[PDB]
């Protein structure tokens, strides 16, 4: 099964500031909730998505939102499911939600932070980035680890047609720039060959 990473980052790959998001974007939060908690209509009795996150990200989420509803949550920590790496998480999942289980696994998302992102980009099953691009240079102190939208990575990572994005996330997604509270930002989907 493939992994998908989902992130919102600035044109300078900023993702974070002071253990939180440096923007308060209500429509971006909804896209995130929607993409990660969406499952092919016919499977939706059985099927559930998984959200894999680092311990720091786990701790950053306002309590009212933990665990993230309607998704299987696994926190990765070297020391709610906990596993010690991405692959341990995958073994826990297959073992726990085995054909003998009534909950089934649809898509598995890596939702942050930088350290987990870095491991997910190293993972041979990761082939898709759902990137929210924020066209401002907001000060940040945590950064996305690999510059997948830059020249150096452009033979590996390709940005897909907007209609391919909508086909994947299964609904109309705004095209182009959305303005909210001082920010322009745009939804993208990038893939690479496995
Ligand atoms: N813009 C966006 O979309 C997002 C931004 N963020 C931002 O990211 C920041 C958090 O990033 P970061 O500090 O790197 O934190 P992470 O959330 O990646 O948490 C780091 C910790 O998780 C565990 N961990 C991470 N990767 C692995 C791995 N490969 N194997 C084993 N354990 C691992 C470790 O926990 P342990 O120390 O317990 O062993 C590590 O100390 C904040 O600024 C947050 O707001 C977060 C999510 C999304
Ligand atoms: C750590 O700093 C954070 C502070 C607050 C929140 C929150 C919240 C409400 C979500 C409710 C729900 O989903 O039910 C988040 C999670 C978040 C947000 N947008 C995100 N946006 C994108 N494009 N990607 C992500 N990975 C996001 C991720 C992890 C991180």
Curated annotation (Swiss-Prot):
The keyword Metal-binding is annotated on this UniProt entry: no
GO BP annotation list: dihydrofolate metabolic process; folic acid metabolic process; one-carbon metabolic process; tetrahydrofolate biosynthetic process
Enzyme Commission number(s): 1.5.1.3
Residues annotated to bind NADP(+): 8, 14-20, 55-57, 77-79, 112-119
Entries under CDD domains matching the protein: DHFR
Gene Ontology molecular function: dihydrofolate reductase activity; NADP binding
Segments forming domain DHFR: 2-192
Domain of life of the organism encoding this protein: Eukaryota
One Pfam family in the UniProt entry: DHFR_1
Metabolic or biological pathway, per its Swiss-Prot or TrEMBL entry: Cofactor biosynthesis; tetrahydrofolate biosynthesis; 5,6,7,8-tetrahydrofolate from 7,8-dihydrofolate: step 1/1
Membrane found in the keyword field: no
Cellular component terms per the entry's GO annotation: mitochondrion
Family statement: Belongs to the dihydrofolate reductase family.
Function: Key enzyme in folate metabolism. Catalyzes an essential reaction for de novo glycine and purine synthesis, and for DNA precursor synthesis.
Protein name as it appears in the record: Dihydrofolate reductase
Species name: Pneumocystis carinii
Lineage start: Eukaryota, Fungi, Dikarya, Ascomycota, Taphrinomycotina
């Amino acid at each position: 099964k493939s992994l998908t990473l989902i992130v919102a980052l600035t044109t300078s790959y900023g993702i974070g500031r002071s253990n939180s998001l440096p923007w308060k974007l209500k429509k971006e939060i909804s896209y995130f909730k929607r993409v990660t908690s969406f499952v092919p209509t016919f499977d939706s009795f059985e099927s559930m998505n998984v959200v894999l996150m680092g311990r720091k990200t786990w701790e950053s989420i306002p309590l009212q939102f933990r665990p993230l509803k309607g998704r299987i949550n696994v926190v990765i920590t070297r020391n709610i499911h906990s596993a010690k790496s991405l692959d341990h998480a995958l073994e826990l999942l297959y073992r726990t939600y085995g054909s003998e289980s009534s909950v089934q696994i649809n898509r598995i998302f890596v939702i942050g932070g930088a350290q987990l992102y870095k491991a997910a980009m190293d993972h041979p099953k990761l082939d898709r980035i759902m990137a929210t691009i924020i066209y401002k240079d907001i000060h940040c102190d945590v950064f996305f680890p690999l510059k997948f939208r830059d020249k150096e990575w452009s033979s590996v990572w390709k940005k897909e047609k907007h209609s391919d994005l909508e086909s994947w996330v299964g609904t109309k997604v705004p095209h182009g720039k959305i303005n909210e509270d001082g920010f322009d930002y745009e939804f993208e989907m990038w893939t690479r060959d496995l």
